[PDB]
Design a binder for this molecule. Structure first.
Ligand code: SF4
Ligand SMILES: [Zn+2]
Ligand SMILES: [Zn+2]
Ligand SMILES: [Zn+2]
Lengths: 280, 675
DNA sequence: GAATTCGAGCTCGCAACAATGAGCACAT
DNA sequence: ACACTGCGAGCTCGAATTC
């Protein structure tokens, strides 16, 4: 179904991130829904990555490098709750940091940038309209979730590179907009599985209980039960036809001719995802 | 789309009509069948132009004997080219619906500086020079030696035009200004004189105001054209100021000493008729003697003509033909250029205006200048008061004349100033899928201090801070462009400088760049192209200007250029000038218009024109604040038109500065979302 | 059955009203 | 030969409980 995604999340750190009409700090409501967003992203996407960049005082600083750690992002967003948020942000600098290290991903992925933008002004030392010609060349899909207004350059950035642009009604609308980005849009990597509690198979580098890549030899270490949940869409199971004694619950499949019931026909197709007579 | 108005089959060139726009054609048909005038009002610029042209062009098919010609008077040359391009879009729609051709031609007229092919005369900058360099190449004494066909100076385009451009007319194909030059190029004819010759046999004709309102022009281009026509005065909210400036001459010392040089150089040529030179040398002495006084200002509109016969003994009977013989004396003298004799024609036009037109005129000699007790620069104004002495030929010659704009502020002032009786006098209002405009009257400040731009409430810092605290707190919630009209140049300069001495202008420059519109044209067009570029990228800009300026009347702020339009006070004229203080005397005796009710009407038509320059389209949304306490009263907010008054509620009527932002921020959040 | 408390609406009298700036298109 | 738009006064109701 979906493909791999290397999604940066750009967070605004302007002076206007101390504004009301949210949770009483505008930055800490953004960081609250983002920690929910990182958790929901890695569950509908097994082998993807997340980077988080912030912008403050005409400069961009990479808060977290592009790595598929579903814990190292949440413990860094909890650290940056008390950020000072002085100055106006930049959009040329943030899409240059998110392009100097997103240009070098392989071509069979879906590289993306999600800009959460609260300020209205992007004071930047160069022209923006050559980045959008460059981002369209590098197949980067930039989507913006705006706050309180609609900037013109954020619609040109969204519709030319290929993303979307939406503006917040309230906090309930903000959580609904982030849940549209967890779904993936419709090459062979080398991972190593992690038998023995959680060790490394390539260089015996023991570390904690994570699906993160190896910090020494550079091999991605995933858990094979996590990839197993995303099966049963490929070669899926078919429906049945219906016209006492059952086969599943013991009290009609057209493959192996095994009679089911109404409480089993709702359970095999929805939750079990495999015919109990076909396994024999 | 075979749309049906109450008697016609109107071919509309679109698919969706707006329910107010169909009712515009019913009231427009109600004028033409009644053979009378009409004062209509509908906001937009396009959509109004394509609906008016759809009915009248379809009206002359069902009744081809009642109306024959449509004269469309627009403001200037950019809107002349816009109306013609909306006409061929309707014509090509007729070419698909019927599959035929039509005996239907439509022109566009402008000055000789626009229709010009000859290379040595086109790159002249000023408009009054291209007439002279033409007149040195095409006058009847210049072509007098061209009957021998020698190598004397001549225009090849004019001399080719009268030999072949008479037997065949223009066939079809609605012409722009550029299309007429392209037709004149590939055929070899004049573009200017082909447009003037073929204006008598046309169906739609689009020129400016001054071919019909100016009395010394309309007897040359539009005297014998049509006795059964339809005139449309598009965007004619300031139609009275065009009618006053056309019949008003202004004389000063700088002009009069140049007439002495023209009278000097005419005396060297007669020796190489003579009673006419002693006539003008007599008249130039008297007008200089009247400007020689240093006394109180005085007015005497027919008593000038008595004192002109006392010391100088010149009667008024030869004075009526003063400008006539000077046009004939320069013909028999065969002068090359005529832009040099422009002061002497201006003195001769003054002489033929004080002899005939004296019912509602005045002559104001002002030795005491503006604000200074002794500066040697006196000036006499020959100011017209009655604005209905310029449409009285237009209201009588034609069949029906339709005065339409978007901001006719009360509909009953216009038939009172202009002496006529309409048959509809209707208004309209746009219908929308949202509420695309949120007007508000930001009154008292953030600490319950009045905000008004009066004359005694301008130098106190409790108001200048509340103007600075407003533009600061609106430049953080409005995206990509704010137009802030001030009331004058000396008030815009004395407030930005008083924001810089305080700590307010440094906090606006953090959000948005600020560009200032100045009087000169080079620095304005530079500061206007960096404004429209700073709204396209993410910086966001502020264009703070004046209200009776060039940007407020010419530049059309489309969406995301000027989301907010901030009026920094009611834009009054100088209410103590001696010209305006005499015009309100005529407006109080005649027509009984109260002198306070005219200054508000004049101001609410400039405060609604530039505010209404922020919405042009279906998807355009726009904030429009009115940062003055005086806007809140009944005789001022009841004057702004019915398409920006139907959304001005009573909650948004005396809003403070901080509460005006949370109506600004809530409106811009609602508009940013899809339909 | 005839008061109250606090609300609503419509008539109408009362007292005192305001109004400050700057330039190019069109005829022989 | 002065005086615009706002605004508390009487007047008379209402709902529900009192005296
Ligand atoms: S006569 Fe024709 S070519 Fe000559 S100046 Fe006039 S418009 Fe131009
Ligand atoms: Zn390893
Ligand atoms: Zn069963
Ligand atoms: Zn089976």
């Amino acid at each position: 179904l979906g493909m791999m995604r290397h999604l940066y999340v750009v967070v605004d750190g302007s002076r206007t991130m101390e504004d009301q009409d949210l949770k009483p700090n505008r930055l800490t409501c953004t960081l609250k829904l983002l920690e929910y967003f990182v958790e929901e992203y890695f569950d509908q996407n097994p082998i993807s990555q997340i980077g988080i960049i912030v912008t403050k005082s005409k400069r961009a600083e990479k808060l977290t490098e592009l790595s598929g750690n579903p814990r190292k992002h949440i413990t860094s967003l909890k650290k940056a709750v008390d950020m000072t948020c002085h100055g106006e942000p930049s959009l040329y600098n943030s899409l240059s940091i998110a392009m100097q290290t997103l240009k070098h991903m392989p071509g069979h992925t879906s590289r993306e940038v999600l800009i959460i933008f609260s300020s209205l002004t992007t004071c930047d030392p160069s022209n923006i309209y050559d980045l959008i010609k460059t981002l369209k060349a590098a197949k980067i899909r930039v989507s913006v979730i705006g706050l309180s207004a609609e900037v013109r350059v954020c619609t040109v950035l969204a519709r030319e590179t290929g993303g979307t642009y939406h503006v917040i009604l309230d906090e309930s609308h903000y959580k609904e907009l982030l849940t549209h980005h967890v779904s993936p849009p419709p090459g062979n990597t080398e991972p190593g599985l992690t038998l023995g509690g959680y060790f490394c198979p390539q260089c015996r580098a023991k570390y904690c209980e994570l699906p993160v890549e190896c910090k020494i030899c550079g091999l991605t270490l995933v858990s094979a039960p996590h990839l197993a949940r995303s099966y049963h869409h490929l070669f899926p199971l078919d429906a049945f036809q219906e016209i006492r004694f059952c086969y599943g619950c013991q009290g009609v499949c057209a493959v192996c001719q095994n009679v089911f019931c109404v409480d089993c026909d709702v359970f095999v197709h929805d939750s079990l995802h495999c015919c109990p007579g076909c396994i024999h | 789309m075979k749309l049906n108005v109450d008697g016609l089959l109107v071919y509309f060139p679109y698919d969706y009509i707006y329910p107010e726009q169909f009712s515009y054609m019913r009231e427009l048909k109600r004028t033409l069948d009644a053979k009378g005038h009409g004062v209509l009002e509908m906001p937009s610029g396009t959509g109004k132009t394509v609906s008016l042209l759809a009915l009248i062009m379809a009206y002359q098919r069902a009744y081809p004997l009642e109306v024959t010609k449509l004269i469309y008077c627009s403001r200037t040359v950019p809107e002349i080219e816009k109306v013609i391009e909306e006409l061929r879009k309707l014509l090509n729609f007729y070419e698909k619906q019927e599959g035929e051709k039509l005996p239907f031609l439509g022109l566009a007229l402008s000055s000789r500086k626009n229709l010009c092919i000859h290379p040595e005369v086109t790159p002249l900058r000023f408009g009054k020079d291209v007439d002279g360099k033409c007149h040195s190449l095409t006058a009847s004494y210049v072509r007098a030696q061209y009957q021998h066909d020698t190598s004397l100076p001549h225009c090849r385009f004019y001399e080719e035009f009268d030999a072949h451009g008479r037997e065949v007319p223009l066939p079809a194909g609605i012409y722009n200004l550029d299309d007429l030059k392209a037709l004149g190029r590939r055929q070899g004819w004049c573009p200017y004189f082909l447009a003037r010759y073929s204006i008598l046999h046309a169906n739609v004709v689009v020129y400016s105001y001054h071919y019909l309102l100016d009395p010394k022009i309309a007897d040359l281009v539009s005297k014998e054209l049509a006795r059964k026509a339809v005139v449309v005065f598009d965007e004619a909210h300031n139609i009275d100021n065009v009618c006053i400036d056309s019949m008003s001459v202004n004389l000063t010392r700088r002009t009069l000493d140049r007439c002495q040089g023209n009278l000097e150089t005419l005396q060297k040529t007669v020796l190489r008729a003579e009673h006419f030179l002693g006539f003008l040398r007599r008249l130039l002495e008297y007008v200089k003697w009247r400007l020689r006084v240093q006394h109180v200002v005085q007015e005497s509109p027919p008593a000038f003509l008595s004192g002109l016969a006392q010391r100088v003994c010149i009667q008024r009977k030869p004075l009526r033909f003063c400008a006539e013989r000077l046009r004939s004396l320069l013909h028999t003298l065969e002068i090359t250029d005529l832009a040099d004799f422009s002061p002497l024609t201006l003195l001769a036009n003054f002489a033929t205006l004080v002899s005939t037109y004296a019912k509602g005129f005045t002559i104001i000699i002002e030795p005491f200048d503006d604000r200074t007790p002794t500066i040697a620069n006196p000036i006499l104004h020959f100011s017209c008061m009655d604005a209905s002495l310029a449409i009285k030929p237009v209201f009588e010659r034609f069949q029906s004349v339709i005065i339409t704009s978007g901001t006719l502020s009360p509909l009953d002032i216009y038939p009172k100033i202009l002496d006529f009786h309409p048959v509809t006098m209707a208004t309209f209002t746009m219908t929308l899928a949202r509420v695309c405009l949120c007007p508000m009257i930001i009154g008292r400040g953030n600490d319950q201090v009045a905000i008004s731009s009066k004359f005694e409430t301008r130098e106190d810092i409790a108001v200048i801070r509340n103007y600075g605290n407003l533009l600061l707190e609106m430049s953080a919630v409005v995206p990509d462009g704010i137009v802030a009209f001030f009331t004058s140049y000396q008030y815009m300069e004395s407030t930005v400088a008083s924001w810089y001495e305080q700590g307010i202008l440094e906090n606006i420059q953090r959000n948005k760049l600020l560009f200032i519109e100045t009087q000169d044209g080079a620095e304005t067009s530079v500061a206007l192209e960096k404004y429209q570029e700073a709204c396209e990228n993410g910086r966001g800009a502020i264009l703070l200007s004046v209200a009776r300026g060039k940007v407020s009347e010419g530049i059309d702020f489309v969406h995301h250029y000027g989301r907010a339009v901030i009026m920094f006070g009611v834009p009054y004229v100088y209410t103590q000038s001696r010209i305006l203080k005499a015009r309100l005397e005529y407006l109080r005796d005649q027509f009984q218009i109260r002198e306070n009710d005219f200054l508000t009407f004049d101001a609410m038509r400039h405060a609604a024109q530039c505010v209404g320059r922020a919405i042009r389209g279906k998807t355009d949304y726009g904030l429009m604040v009115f940062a003055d306490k005086r806007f809140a009263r009944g005789d001022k907010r009841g004057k702004l038109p019915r398409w920006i008054q139907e959304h001005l509620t009573d909650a948004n009527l005396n809003l403070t500065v901080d509460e005006g932002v949370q109506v600004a921020k809530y409106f811009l959040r609602q508009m940013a979302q899809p339909f």
